[PDB]
Ligand binder design. Structure first.
Ligand SMILES: O=C(O)CNC(=O)c1c(O)n(C2CCCCC2)c(=O)n(C2CCCCC2)c1=O
Ligand SMILES: [Zn+2]
Length: 333
């Protein structure tokens, strides 16, 4: 259901810019910050798109030119990929899995604009994705925009939910067609879209069985093993039962991605560059009186801890698998 831009500017996007996948989805609600329904969705840790937060209102004028002029001289982490399917490799965990081979490159902002402009010409199949946490090295005008964010609203949300401290603000600038594969994060996230359009497909924590994350010690920890473009239903049979929550966010929209919810993010094809700012918050602390049965994301937390501990106990991540199979084979299956 593509939205109609004001001023009769025509459809902002059409379904031809969306990639096709095998699973069905239901839409994420697009609500107003003043709507109590959006307030309970955040309280019940369910996704919602807020359309009128003014959270990054001063940033809605950002583009490659404005940023290059005022972002300043600093190092920005840039990730390269030979195709649309990006993928992340925890550098620290590269040691555990020696066989795997991957990617990232540091550079000043103008260098990124040159590469993005260089690849613009030639129709190069390569794609890039800038992802850098905001720090003090940003120029004057960018700090003014940063201060112009709606801190009143988001800070009130932080207290209302008892969340932890704002861990970081992440600036994401991507090329059209970029795909962030399905993965889950362990912190609460307000996904503030600025430039371009991004299709966000979320899956609840209870669909862990359908998305098959890599081992915790694997560099791709928290990412799905399933190739959405070509699912291996033999290895990943329960992916045929996956059902996602879908939406397309545009400038001014804020998507709440609750902690441990999977998200598959893609910048629309032929939609130009996309710009996003994320607000990361440590989740609310675990209550003192645990209510059973546990939430799905609590069981995911338990599973993560077991794998982590067996890695230390056995003194080798590679032994975690064999010992877990020995434990269940013919005893719990
Ligand atoms: O694209 C968006 O709008 C939202 N993107 C994200 O939340 C990303 C993300 O959470 N992650 C990792 C976070 C830590 C745990 C493993 C996944 C990414 O690597 N990436 C990219 C993945 C490809 C390689 C560079 C980093 C994310 O985008
Ligand atoms: Zn994420």
């Amino acid at each position: 259901e593509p939205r109609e831009e004001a001023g009769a500017l025509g459809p902002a996007w059409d379904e031809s810019q969306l990639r096709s996948y095998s699973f069905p989805t239901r839409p994420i609600p697009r609500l107003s910050q003043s709507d109590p329904r959006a307030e309970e969705l955040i309280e019940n840790e369910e996704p919602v798109v807020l359309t009128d937060t003014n959270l990054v209102y001063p940033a809605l004028k950002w583009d490659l030119e404005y940023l290059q002029e005022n972002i300043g001289n600093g190092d920005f982490s840039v990730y390269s990929a030979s195709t649309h399917k990006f993928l992340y490799y925890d550098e620290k965990k590269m040691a555990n899995f020696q066989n795997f081979k991957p990617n990232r490159e540091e550079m000043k902002f103008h260098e990124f604009v040159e590469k993005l402009q260089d690849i613009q010409q030639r129709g190069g199949e390569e794609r890039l994705y800038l992802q850098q946490t905001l720090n003090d090295t940003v120029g004057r005008k960018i700090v003014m925009d940063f201060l112009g964010f709606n801190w009143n609203w988001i800070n009130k949300q932080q207290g209302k939910r008892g969340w932890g401290q704002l861990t970081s603000n992440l600036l994401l600038i991507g090329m059209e067609g970029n795909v962030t594969p399905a993965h889950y994060d362990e912190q609460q996230n307000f996904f503030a879209q600025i430039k371009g359009y991004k299709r966000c497909i979320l899956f609840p924590p209870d669909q862990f069985e359908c998305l098959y994350p890599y081992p915790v010690h694997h560099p791709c920890d928290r990412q799905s093993q399933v190739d959405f473009d070509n699912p291996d239903y033999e290895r990943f049979p329960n992916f045929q039962n996956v059902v996602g929550y879908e939406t397309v966010v545009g400038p001014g929209d804020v998507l709440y991605i609750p902690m441990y919810w999977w998200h598959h993010i893609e910048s629309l094809l032929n939609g130009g560059i996309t710009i996003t700012v994320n607000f990361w918050y440590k989740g609310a602390p675990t209550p003192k009186r645990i209510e059973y049965p546990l939430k799905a994301h609590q069981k995911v937390a338990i599973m993560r801890n077991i794998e982590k501990m067996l890695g230390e106990a056995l003194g080798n991540p590679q032994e975690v698998g064999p010992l877990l199979n020995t434990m269940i084979k013919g005893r719990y299956n």
